[PDB]
C-alpha cells in the first residue's frame, strides 16, 4: 500500500507511483513483501528532482548508484 | 508503517517513498518482529540530497558506500 | 517507534527513515511487547551528512566500519 | 525514552537514533524495553563524528571505543 | 535517568547515550528500573574524544567493569 496525497514536481521533475522492478531482482513477479504501509503527505521536487512513490526491488545499484571512488 | 509529512528536495535531489529490498534479501527471513511506526515531519534536501523513507534489507552495504581502516 | 520533526540534509547528504536489517539478522520470531521510542526535534547535517532514524541490526559491527573490529 | 533536541553533524558526520542490536544477541532477553531515560539537548559533532542515542545490546564489548586500559 | 545539556564532539570524536547490555545480560533482578540520575552540564571533547553517558555493564575493564573469577 503505497499512497501519496500532494506532490509538486517543478523544473524537469518527474513522479512515479507504484513499484520499481529492477532486472537485478529477476522479472516483475509482483507481491513479495508488503510488510509495511507507505504514505506521504506533501512532496516537493524542484531542479530535476525525481519523485519515486513505491518500494523498489533491485540490488545492483540502489536506483541511483555508481560510485567507484574509494575514500 | 512509514508516514511522512513534508519532503522538500531540490538541486537534483532524489526522494524515495518505500522499503528497499535488494536481491540479497531474497530466499531469506524478512520477518523478525520488526514492528515500528516511523514518521518524519519535514525533510529538507538541498544539493543532490537522497531521501529514503522506509526500512531496508541487505548485508552488502548500508544503502550508501562507506569503508576505511580503524585505529 | 521513531519520530523526527526537522531534518536538514544538504551538500550530498542522505537520510534513512527506517530500520537497517543486515542479511545476517534473520533469526526472529513473532511476538508483541514493549519497544523504545526515539524522537529528535532538529537534525542539522551539512556536507556528506547521514541521518539514521531507526535501529541497527548487524553482526559485523555498527552502521559504520571506520572504527572498531572483532574482539 | 531516548530523545534529542538539536543535533549538528558536519563534515561526513552520521547520527543514529534508536538502539544497537548486534547479531550476537539471541532470544534470551532481547526485549530490554524502556529501562532508562536518556535525553540530550545540544549535540554538536563535526569531522568523523558519531552520535549514538540509544542503548547497546550484545557481546561486542562496546559500540565505539579506541582500546582497553593503557598504562 | 541520564540527561545532557551541551555536548560537542569534533575531530574523530563521538558520543554515546544509553546503557550497555553485555551478552551475559542480567543474571538476576526482575525489578528492572533506573535508579541513579546523572546530568552533565557541558561536554567539550575534541581530538578522538568519546562521551559515554549511560550505565556501564560490559565485562572488559575500560569504561566498564565486571566481577569475574580471580585466581
From Swiss-Prot, chains A, B, C, D, E:
Q: List the disulfide bonds.
A: none
Its annotated compartments are: Cytoplasm
Report which superkingdom the organism of origin falls in. Answer: Eukaryota
Which parts of the sequence are annotated with region: Prion domain (PrD)? 1-65
The UniProt record's further free-text remark is: [Het-s] is the prion form of het-s. [Het-s] is the result of a conformational change of the cellular het-s protein that becomes self-propagating and infectious. This conformational change generates a form of het-S that assembles into amyloid fibrils. [Het-s] is transmitted as a non-Mendelian cytoplasmic element. On vegetative cell fusion with neutral [Het-s*] strains, the prion spreads throughout the cellular network and converts the non-prion form of het-s to a prion state, making the strains acquire the [het-s] phenotype. Interacts with het-S to trigger incompatibility. In P.anserina, the het-s locus exists as 2 incompatible alleles, het-s and het-S. Strains of het-s genotype (e.g. A, C, s, and V) can display 2 distinct phenoypes, the neutral (prion-free) [Het-s*], which is compatible with het-S strains (e.g. D, S, U, and X), and the reactive [Het-s] phenotype, which causes rapid cell death in het-S strains. Although the two alleles het-s and het-S differ from each other by 14 amino acids, vegetative incompatibility between s and S strains can be attributed to a single amino acid difference in the proteins encoded by the het-s locus.
Q: Any idea what job this protein has?
A: Responsible for heterokaryon incompatibility, a process that ensures that during spontaneous, vegetative cell fusion only compatible cells from the same colony survive (non-self-recognition). Forms a prion for the non-Mendelian trait [het-s]. Interacts with het-S from incompatible cells to trigger a lethal reaction that prevents the formation of viable heterokaryons. It is unknown if the native, soluble protein has a cellular function.
Assembly and partners are described as: Homodimer. Forms heterodimers with het-S.
Domains: what does the record tell us? The globular domain is dispensable for prion formation and incompatibility function. However, the het-S globular domain, but not the het-s globular domain, is essential for programmed cell death.
Protein name as it appears in the record: Heterokaryon incompatibility protein s
Q: Which species is listed as the source?
A: Podospora anserina
- The encoding gene is het-s
